[PDB]
Structures are given as structure tokens and as C-alpha cells.
Amino acid sequence: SNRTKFVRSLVREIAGLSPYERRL
Amino acid sequence: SVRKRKMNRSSVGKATRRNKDKQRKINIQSNPIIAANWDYSLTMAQNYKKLGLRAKLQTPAGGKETEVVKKLEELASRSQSEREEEWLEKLYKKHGDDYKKMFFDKKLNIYQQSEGDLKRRLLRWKKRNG
């Protein structure tokens, strides 16, 4: 679903990167 | 038990209930035709066969239409609101049978009913009244 993908991208941009993700 | 002995010794008396015989006897309570023809002397399967009906649809385990006519004979035994009628009459007077024109009536077709619904309602009104 396009709406679900958009919501996921919005949440990804809002939440930033996790502490373990920041290591990348 | 202690309670049973106390109850037996007590003068209150037992609340006797005799219903063993009533377990064997069951009266039909879902059909008037069957009740008149049903015979409690025979079993469920025997009664169904006597009436001419099937008591089981699947192959039963273990070894094994004078009445159905009455059941078949037993098989042979909405309008519009006043405001709805007035609304239909208004549109009929304003547009007659012009369904397409009636559809676009902004101040009489308050509810945007389809052409099919409008024509069906008008036909029902005509049949009921004229």
C-alpha cells in the first residue's frame, strides 16, 4: 500500500536513527 | 457424609423430586402437524419413517407420502410514506416522466437518488395510486 509506505517513511524520518543504527 | 446424615436426622424433610419417568417422555414442541401424527410408542427413527421423513442425512452407524402431503400443502397457506409520496408527486408534476431532467432538479431532488431508484419509486407510486 502506498499510504503504508508513506507512513513508514514519515516515521523513519521522524524517529531518526537508533543508537545501534547510528554506528553505520 | 456428615451433611447427609444431618439432613436425614433433621425434621425439615427432603425436597423430593420425582422426574425419572419424565426423561423417557418428550412431547413434540416445534410442529403442530407432527404432534397430531407422532406416536410416542415408536422411537425417533420409527416415528420419522412412519411420518415419511429422514432422521439422518449421513450413513448411520450400525445396522438398521400420506403425511408429507399436508406439509407440502402448508406451503400454500410494503408501501411508501406520506412524505415520500408527496416528494414523489412533486417531482412527477415538475418533470413528468423525464427521468434525466428529474435527476438534475436541485431544489426538489434533495437526495441525489439515481435514475433507477427514482423511476422504480415513481412506478410503485403509480401502481399504488395511478
Binding site: - | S1, V2, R3, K6, M7, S10, V12, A15, R17
Partner: protein, 71 residues
């Protein structure tokens, strides 16, 4: 050592411990154990008057009806 107990009167109320070894007074629960089969029987329901439990069975038989006979 022991004294009369208000709940049971079994004369098993410890003076120093201020508790009854038989019925468990003042504990809300009544002391009882499975291994004490004879003890349970001695204090099982029905050993007393059963002022209210007696009429429950009779009342149920009538469906807990209320009112009076129509004569």
C-alpha cells in the same frame, strides 16, 4: 497455656501467642488441612445448626418464589 476461644470455644487459644491452634483465630481463614481428614470432618459443614443452609434446597425447589398463596 490455652484458653477458651470466642470463635470456636475449643479451649485452644494460646495465652502467650494470642492465637487458636484449632480454628486459626484471629486469622480470617479457618485453619484446616487435607492431612487432617478427621479434623476436617469434626468441623465440616453440617455439624452445627445450619440455620440458613437448611432451607436453601427447599427454596430452590420452588424457584425462589415470592408472594403468597392465592387461596
Amino acid at each position: 497455656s490455652h484458653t477458651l476461644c470466642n470463635r470456636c470455644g475449643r479451649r485452644s487459644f494460646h495465652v502467650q501467642k494470642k492465637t487458636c491452634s484449632s480454628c486459626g483465630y484471629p486469622a480470617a481463614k479457618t485453619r484446616s488441612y487435607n492431612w487432617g481428614a478427621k479434623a476436617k470432618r469434626r468441623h465440616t459443614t453440617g455439624t452445627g445448626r445450619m440455620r440458613y443452609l437448611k432451607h436453601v434446597s427447599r427454596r430452590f425447589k420452588n424457584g425462589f418464589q415470592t408472594g403468597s398463596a392465592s387461596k
